[PDB]
Design a protein around this ligand. Sequence first.
Ligand SMILES: Nc1ncnc2c1ncn2[C@@H]1O[C@H](COP(=O)(O)OP(=O)(O)O)[C@@H](O)[C@H]1O
Ligand SMILES: Nc1ncnc2c1ncn2[C@@H]1O[C@H](COP(=O)(O)OP(=O)(O)O)[C@@H](O)[C@H]1O
Ligand SMILES: Nc1ncnc2c1ncn2[C@@H]1O[C@H](COP(=O)(O)OP(=O)(O)O)[C@@H](O)[C@H]1O
Ligand SMILES: Nc1ncnc2c1ncn2[C@@H]1O[C@H](COP(=O)(O)OP(=O)(O)O)[C@@H](O)[C@H]1O
Ligand SMILES: Nc1ncnc2c1ncn2[C@@H]1O[C@H](COP(=O)(O)OP(=O)(O)O)[C@@H](O)[C@H]1O
Ligand SMILES: [Mg+2]
Ligand SMILES: [Mg+2]
Ligand SMILES: [Mg+2]
Ligand SMILES: [Mg+2]
Ligand SMILES: [Mg+2]
Lengths: 367, 367, 367, 367, 367
Amino acid sequence: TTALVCDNGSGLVKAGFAGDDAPRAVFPSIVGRPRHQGVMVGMGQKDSYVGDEAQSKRGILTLKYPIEHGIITNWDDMEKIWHHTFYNELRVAPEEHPTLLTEAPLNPKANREKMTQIMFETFNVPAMYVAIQAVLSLYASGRTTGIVLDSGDGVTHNVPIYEGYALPHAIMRLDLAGRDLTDYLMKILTERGYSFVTTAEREIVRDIKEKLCYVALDFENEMATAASSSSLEKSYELPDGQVITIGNERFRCPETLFQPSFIGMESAGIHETTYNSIMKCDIDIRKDLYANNVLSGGTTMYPGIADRMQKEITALAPSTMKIKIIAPPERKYSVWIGGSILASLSTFQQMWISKQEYDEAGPSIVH
Amino acid sequence: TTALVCDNGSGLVKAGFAGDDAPRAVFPSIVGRPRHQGVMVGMGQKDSYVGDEAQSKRGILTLKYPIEHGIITNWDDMEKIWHHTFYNELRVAPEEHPTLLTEAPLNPKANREKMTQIMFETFNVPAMYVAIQAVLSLYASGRTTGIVLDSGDGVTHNVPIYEGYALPHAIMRLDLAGRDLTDYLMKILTERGYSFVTTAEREIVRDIKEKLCYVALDFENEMATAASSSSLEKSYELPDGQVITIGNERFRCPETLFQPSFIGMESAGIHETTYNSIMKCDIDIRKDLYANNVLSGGTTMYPGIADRMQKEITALAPSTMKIKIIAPPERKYSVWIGGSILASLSTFQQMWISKQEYDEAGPSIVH
Amino acid sequence: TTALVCDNGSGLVKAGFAGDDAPRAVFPSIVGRPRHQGVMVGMGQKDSYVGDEAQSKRGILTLKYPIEHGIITNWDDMEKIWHHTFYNELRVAPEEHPTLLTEAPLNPKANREKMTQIMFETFNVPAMYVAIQAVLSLYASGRTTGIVLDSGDGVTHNVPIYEGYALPHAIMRLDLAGRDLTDYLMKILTERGYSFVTTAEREIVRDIKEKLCYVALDFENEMATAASSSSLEKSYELPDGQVITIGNERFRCPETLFQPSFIGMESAGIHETTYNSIMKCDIDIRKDLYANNVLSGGTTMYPGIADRMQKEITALAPSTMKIKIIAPPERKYSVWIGGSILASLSTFQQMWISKQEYDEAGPSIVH
Amino acid sequence: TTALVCDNGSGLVKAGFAGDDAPRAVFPSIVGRPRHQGVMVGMGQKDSYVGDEAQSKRGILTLKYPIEHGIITNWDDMEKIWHHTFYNELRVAPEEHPTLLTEAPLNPKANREKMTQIMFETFNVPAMYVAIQAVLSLYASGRTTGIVLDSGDGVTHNVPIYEGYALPHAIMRLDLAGRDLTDYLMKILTERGYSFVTTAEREIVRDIKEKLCYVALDFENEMATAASSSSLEKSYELPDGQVITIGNERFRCPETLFQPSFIGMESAGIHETTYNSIMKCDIDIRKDLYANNVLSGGTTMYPGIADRMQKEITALAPSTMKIKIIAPPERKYSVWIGGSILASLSTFQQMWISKQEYDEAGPSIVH
Amino acid sequence: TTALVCDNGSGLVKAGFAGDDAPRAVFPSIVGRPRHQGVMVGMGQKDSYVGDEAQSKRGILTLKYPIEHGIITNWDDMEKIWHHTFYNELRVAPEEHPTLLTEAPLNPKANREKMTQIMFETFNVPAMYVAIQAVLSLYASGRTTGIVLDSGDGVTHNVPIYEGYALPHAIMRLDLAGRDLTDYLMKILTERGYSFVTTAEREIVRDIKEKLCYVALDFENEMATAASSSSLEKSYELPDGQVITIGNERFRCPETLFQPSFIGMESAGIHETTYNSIMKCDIDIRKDLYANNVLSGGTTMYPGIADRMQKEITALAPSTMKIKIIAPPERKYSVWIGGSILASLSTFQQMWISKQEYDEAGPSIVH
Ligand SMILES: Nc1ncnc2c1ncn2[C@@H]1O[C@H](COP(=O)(O)OP(=O)(O)O)[C@@H](O)[C@H]1O
Ligand SMILES: Nc1ncnc2c1ncn2[C@@H]1O[C@H](COP(=O)(O)OP(=O)(O)O)[C@@H](O)[C@H]1O
Ligand SMILES: Nc1ncnc2c1ncn2[C@@H]1O[C@H](COP(=O)(O)OP(=O)(O)O)[C@@H](O)[C@H]1O
Ligand SMILES: Nc1ncnc2c1ncn2[C@@H]1O[C@H](COP(=O)(O)OP(=O)(O)O)[C@@H](O)[C@H]1O
Ligand SMILES: Nc1ncnc2c1ncn2[C@@H]1O[C@H](COP(=O)(O)OP(=O)(O)O)[C@@H](O)[C@H]1O
Ligand SMILES: [Mg+2]
Ligand SMILES: [Mg+2]
Ligand SMILES: [Mg+2]
Ligand SMILES: [Mg+2]
Ligand SMILES: [Mg+2]
């Protein structure tokens, strides 16, 4: 019987069988629709394109993320990505497998209740479960205690966890993520003269971000590099063949995580949110949380994140105590690994919500 | 066969085999229950935590003393601590050993009668005994005559004892103790800005009390120290990493024993209770009691107690006569030592209440 | 001109005009002082509270009996009660009236000599007299011969009196009384779990004593009632709203009068003191004393006293002769009635000590 | 000469002349600072905005409460609000008027001593006084006896008061208040999809709380209303023009006062704190306190508070006795009314601390 | 001394003295170069033609806009237009006057830094300033708050402005403008048979656009007019003498602003950009922005723009709130009027960048 683990974050769907080391199908959550009405006979006609296929044909298509800041914006688009994910990648009837789904904490009740309704009614699933991302990441680490910072494309979380358990009143979500940083890198990029207006080009600048951008230890040093131009300016090649040269924009893109005042948000940077999250927790456990702070997600991948963290949190907190930050490689797939490992635990099998227990007990029993 | 000596006071259980120099198992009488409902699979689940284990995880748990001012408040919690004490620390079937238990004087009949009922029915014990604390302390001193002041966490006693015998009409109990002094140090502590609201934090301030607080010879000198801040302010470190600095609060916490008007009680300080206890005794024996006044318990541990005693009692009593105060080191375990030594005496073995003599004669035969 | 009769016993002042059937002002001899220093503007400020007024506000005030076992402990407190008694209740300048005061027999010379000094110097009195309580009670009975047992709050007396006259060598005082019995009912009460530590609460347990407690004919029957719980347990309501249930404590409180070994006194019970008092008297008169034994005071009010007396004295004395005990209702005010009737006798008017005869003859002429 | 009464609580400053029925100037204690650096010439420039003015321009400004849980967090911000309060609203030189200031009980000594230092040195005041809030509320009621529950934005108190006087050992403070309830209504609000992240939006949700939220008699009935959606969902309009519909969130916001476990605090609800406060008081006075329990402050304004109180306290306390709760309309201004009435009393004029008596006697004489 | 205000947008240079009601010199930013090499002696020879002069001789000359979408494409052409603007129209040595220059927001840093370098080095200017267009338009309106839509020939902006200040993260630029609409009217025009291939003819079709084209309230009504040909077809005369008749092309040219899908751009129309700009602003201020939305520039001149705006924005936004659109006549010169009024303000004179402060501080100090 096994199980399917489906990590539905904005920007990437990671899906695959439980008990395995990595997800098999990893593709973007995009639903491409042709921008220009096309006059051929034979072509497509392909009214809708989905996932990596939409990535193949960006210059025709208007790309549309169905999921924004963790919240599902357009339901039938979502449904398309799931249907494509199941039959065209994993090759599987959902009626043969319980399915573990993922979601951000502190997220509107509509996402659980509609999600579950889709999975039972539209696909037919013998049982399923929807879990909090950060707990899955924490299982992937191999640890029971720690404060998780999960930064994906839609959303960034802090979830403190002590000896199992959890602290819901210290959970802190923040909308800063790969999508905000890509748009911020758009408008900062345009100051060199490089104009990326369209959805398709957004995905190009996502690529630039993913390769080139790094997090400076001290911002001022980056400013000095911008002042004298040596290793900081790097050449990147577009798909067209043009050459972009980016200097300070390389490192002032991800500086937004520490200084959200660059986007015009009053929310304190990710270091003050993690420290703030530690503050709201009981005086006893803070030492462990400081020692054990875990990183997950695509927007933790920027070289130089962990070191700046271990500067900034060490400047906020009392010096007397050790702040080890644990950011393991293969952290982008931490949530999916944790969904896998959780599905392979036998003590979890009682917790699946059954197709039957759903029809009789309602939508109210997902929580 | 030997025997088990179990010293059940509020705050600490001291237990071990008779005929030995110290108790082996010494842990707090706390029953931790998780405050926040924890979402993991595998964790615990550990609906109840007990003793030192509850101390390990204070920031999750709501700590609950099962015993308050010597009186047993919650019976099944007590039972848990005993069951944990026997099988998880002393490693012993109670059916192999007579068991000597302890209790404060002047204490409601419900504690003897329910206690004994638990020990015979729930654990099965071949015989047991429940003794008055101060008499046990007096055996530990190696002496037959003296007036015992036993200050534990729940309660403070004076028991005058002359040439063996006892004087029940001069026995005086007083609810001032480590628990009242910890709460008083809470609210006085909050005047520096340090806010300790929770049960877990109470145990932190118990730790502060145990290390830092001392009893001033004269209160006025302490006030002068508070006025010019030199040795009186000491730094203490929390488990978090924060630094607390406490000046006059160091010595005005235990001043409450001499001035219970700080808690709003009309009861005269411990020096006027000991002197008052001496007054109610026959004119013949007072000289011995004054010479031989013994100290026991955790709340006698504050540096500077004995000297202030030997000031204050010397100011109450007629000057013509010697007031020696005997406070031996290792006095916190005086009651347990006295239970040990008593269990090793052969002339005491007739006085055990037998499982058989209990079933036939009733609950009324504990007294 | 008339006269003032002032019955100053510990616990209650009974005062009023002579020639009248009862005292008008009857209130407790207490001097209330605020325990907690009060921050308002307007309140009181009322540094001292006295009498029934102090009874109105017990939970603020520390109550202090100025008179202990008949002996005056604190003089300026006494003075306060008298000054309040005169101007705030009887509404009278003491310079208009001779004043008859009361005192226990066998009582230190300081009480007569200081009392008289206060009445002449501080209040100004044209003449006064201080009388032995039991003689006043005997006048109240309407009889010339008898042995009086007067049990008040401070003290219990036996005074044998034959055909007028008196026998000073058979007068026997004993410190057992409402105050000792209230404290004894405190510590016996605490065995149900009911903890009354404070002066204010003492007055609550005085109330319990006054309503509920009775004197058992045979103690053993009371023990049997304690064994099977039927009419012996009665509900009493505190001022708070809590419910106290008291079983054997109802009747073993006043059993202390017959068995002072409950307080740890060697003094023989009130029945052996009355019998002993009869023994020290001349062989001729004993028959009358046995026939005519009179009761007075608040601590004679317990239902069942007279019958137990007429058991116990009948078991001590030779059976051949009638022991009638005379305990009239309205016996609590026997001493005050006797002071009234004595002040109305014309043959007594020569015996007043004049303000003038005092200044010239000294303090030595009170005796 | 008159006097100024200044009620400085977190969230609202109530100030005005003494002897008057209401405060004239009532505005929020906020210090607005522009978030985005503004490029105009002429604008403002207005580096700091204060009070109602900051409320006019929330979308530009970062709002900052200078006072948190009664404790002053940022001193120069405070100073700004006072300076604005005096010259821009009351129109008055402080050198013409003694000034009565307010503060929460049990509050760090730094607030009195720095406050007083500011008022004498920075403004110059001929004399001033700093009073405990609950006593002022109690004067406003027109009563001398009662237990005050004062819930403002920073903090909630219970202060029992008997016949004037006070009981400091029964005073109980609790950090639950309009500020905690607003943040709790934030995160519960976000489950409908309504995302309020910023300080400015916090003040919008404060407005929602103030209009719509009520306290349920029984929580379960509220749950039933949430289950079938009829009168419980109400429409509220934002300043933008969007429509928010809130159902169960209306009444489960203020349920936090009775169940602080919703915020993750172990502190017992406001009903168990008031009952607990009654318990620590002397047995004599509890009946009055139960009869006379007074309410004050903005966080007592929720419709349905008094009735739930008179359910819950009646379930804790012994049924035999009347629990009247007195919550007068115009209770939000109870503290300020009480400061007024106190300043108009002539017997209070001796208690002002003089500018002179301050310079000579120190900062230590505020207490 | 006064000042020069130079509004350099693509298509028209508006220049003149500050403190005046309109610009004196208004001519096209074109640099004409002869297409055919001309064989005469005496003619010209006039290797370069500039401005209105180039307009006089279009059929010989290749017209070349030096500035494209706000970005300066060819620097020495620009320089020519400035040099012609100064000496041949305004008649002025730039060394006598500070000069205020204009530029679009979000525009590459090269334009500020090179512009300033030209003005100081090539012309010599005692001081200058480069301002954001929309702020200048907002000063021209006489208002401090509003969201400006500035549509010129190169570029269209939305800049929201609140109470002075600004919101850089909500500023949105869009390349749709008179130049794109003229080319779109070219290719749509060619469907009647009218072939305009050349740069010179582009300026003819710009003229057609400026006179004849209007913005339809509803596009469908325009389609109906196209269907039955009555008032919608209008005759226009070319400079040659030929007659063009244009029906639906009159109104479907400017429909491109609302539907950029006509040019093949995915960018949402000007109504969704203005609404989107309102969305990114803080919830507090949106109402003002909706009330106060301002129009500026040549591509706002089409009759019927404001009404379609006040349809379309009213269909996007919540109906409950008033959307007034302010489009004043003489709005084409709004930016220049605002530059004038700003130069006449004395509080702005500190903000001029001095020739001296430039040489010492660098090119980096323009920002
Ligand atoms: N190597 C990288 N360097 C920096 N940013 C990255 C990198 N890889 C991806 N990202 C960013 O992180 C996002 C993917 O993170 P992911 O954890 O997969 O999000 P989610 O799980 O919510 O889909 C992308 O949208 C991208 O912007
Ligand atoms: N070193 C110390 N200094 C002062 N107080 C102490 C110290 N050790 C413990 N105590 C206090 O005394 C208590 C323990 O006394 P103990 O005699 O063990 O009580 P019990 O026998 O009733 O458990 C603690 O609760 C603590 O508050
Ligand atoms: N009805 C009663 N039942 C039993 N005890 C009583 C009763 N009335 C009062 N007493 C006790 O007797 C005392 C009062 O006796 P009283 O003769 O007035 O003493 P005195 O004359 O010395 O003041 C009280 O203190 C109380 O304890
Ligand atoms: N009508 C109301 N309904 C419920 N809550 C209110 C209402 N009015 C104000 N409050 C809450 O109470 C607070 C104001 O109380 P207040 O007594 O003025 O506090 P303080 O005196 O400490 O400033 C506000 O912060 C708000 O959250
Ligand atoms: N009366 C009009 N009707 C419609 N379009 C016009 C009209 N006047 C000029 N325009 C268009 O607007 C442009 C000029 O706008 P302007 O604000 O002067 O741009 P900029 O300030 O960027 O030079 C021209 O290129 C033309 O296409
Ligand atoms: Mg993720
Ligand atoms: Mg002990
Ligand atoms: Mg008497
Ligand atoms: Mg208040
Ligand atoms: Mg323009």
